[PDB]
Amino acid sequence: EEFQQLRKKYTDAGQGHVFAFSQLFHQLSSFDPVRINELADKALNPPASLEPLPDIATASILDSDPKDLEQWYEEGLKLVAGNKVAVVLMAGGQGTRLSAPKGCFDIGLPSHKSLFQIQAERIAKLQLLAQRISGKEAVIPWYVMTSGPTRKPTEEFFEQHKYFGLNKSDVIIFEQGVLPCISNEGKILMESKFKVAVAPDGNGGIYQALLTSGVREDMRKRGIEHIHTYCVDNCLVKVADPVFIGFAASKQVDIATKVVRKRNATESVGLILQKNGKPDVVEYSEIDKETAEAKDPKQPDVLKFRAANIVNHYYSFKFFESIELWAHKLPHHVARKPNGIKLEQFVFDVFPMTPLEKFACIEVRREDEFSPLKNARGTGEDDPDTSKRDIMSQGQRWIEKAGGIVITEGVGVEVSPLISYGGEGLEFLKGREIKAPAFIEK
């Protein structure tokens, strides 16, 4: 009846094969088969000039003036105190490459805290450091962007931990768009017959997702003016980092990015770059050996092209307000996964559309800021062990810097975010001994 109305519209569009054979009816009613055809069509039928970003657009935790760094931290913490700052978490992944949602993974710290909890606590701590200047509660909304599979386990998990101390009203879980799977000839793939194989539409899907879910409208009501985005797998992420916030808003950019230093020319890292006079992210493959090896004229101890992308972004709210102008302009790329294709928009494809003066980039310290969880244990790289080690190494550093004496007879100290957000506030440990492995907690 109504069912056959659907089977007609899909068959007319060359996708009647998915009705070949009751939940299907509903899954398929959420898809425009024609729009699938459009994206499959444009995606299946589509010597660049590379230069570093302008020095006017770049800063460095390592190299910039301690005077500017301190001031940016202060201004960024001002913005947090005025409830102007928001975080959008990219939390789509599952832990299958390592089960549960990725943010639930326990990399094996002494506390056994998940990634979600570690991040929540950095938010809690940061609002508390902001309160010391505002005099009142500070609120950083945490918009958690999940995939379809992860939405309910994420909700139940945050519910089971009582939202890690934050107000339920300040943790907003929501969903990014999805697309069916499609074969090599653009025909929708069938996971089983009772359900379409689907997938999330790339980290570029965030922009449209901010509208559909009502997240942008919620930010508007709150007076949000600055937004930090990152991926849940960065176990060291400085959530809502004031130095980043302060930097970007002092230059009043639409978009800013965080990088770490590429130190050896052969590292396979994406680079934030001027590609054809536009800001862009360039894969390592499109980088020539000469340009990869090029040393900086004004600094031969470092490489010319050294801004290694870590998917860690800043946006103005004004920029979000403009999404309706260009959101359609964003191509759905092809992700081959030898049977099929995944149409994925790319978060950075909007970069070249940004005027150069509206774009900025800050290099940060790897060991304090980027330890990605990507691989199973024993891999030796981007795994729970390197993640564990980076956090416990940072913890020992912070302590030792404030005068603590850490003793290792077998390494590192887990410092809870609630005690210290970024190494501050540890003078109480001056003089005392600590037997590593150890765990410092509120």
Author numbering: 30 to 50, 60 to 84, 91 to 142, 145 to 383, 401 to 473, 476 to 507
What does the paper say about this structure?
To understand the catalytic mechanism, two further complexes were also determined – a substrate complex with GlcNAc-1P and a substrate complex with UTP. Ligand binding at the bottom of the active site induces a number of significant conformational changes compared to the “apo-like” structure. The binding of GlcNAc-1P to AfUAP1 is stabilized by hydrogen bonds with Asn249, Gly316, Tyr330, Glu329, Asn355 and Lys437. Interestingly, a PO43− molecule which occupies the same position as the UTP γ-phosphate interacts with R141 and T140 and induce a shift of loops A, B, C, D and α* on the central domain, closing the active site (RMSD vs. “apo-like” structure = 2.1 Å on all Cα atoms). Similar interactions were seen in the CaUAP1–GlcNAc-1P complex with equivalent residues (Tyr310, Asn227, Glu309, Gly294, Asn335, and Lys421) except for the absence of the PO43− molecule, which prevents the ordering of R116 (R141 in AfUAP1). We hypothesise that in the absence of this PO43− molecule, the binding of GlcNAc-1P alone would only cause partial closure of the active site. Lys437 makes direct contacts with the phosphate group of GlcNAc-1P and with the α and β-phosphate of UDP-GlcNAc. Tyr330 establishes a hydrogen bond with the phosphate group of GlcNAc-1P, and Lys148 is involved in UTP binding, contacting the phosphate groups of UTP and pyrophosphate through direct and indirect hydrogen bonds. In agreement with the structural data, the K148M and Y330F mutants affect the Km values of UTP (10-fold increase) and GlcNAc-1P (6-fold increase), respectively. The K437A mutant shows an increase in the Km values of both substrates (32 and 10-fold increase in the Kms of GlcNAc-1P and UTP respectively), which may be the result of disrupting the interaction of Lys437 with the phosphate groups of GlcNAc-1P and UDP-GlcNAc.
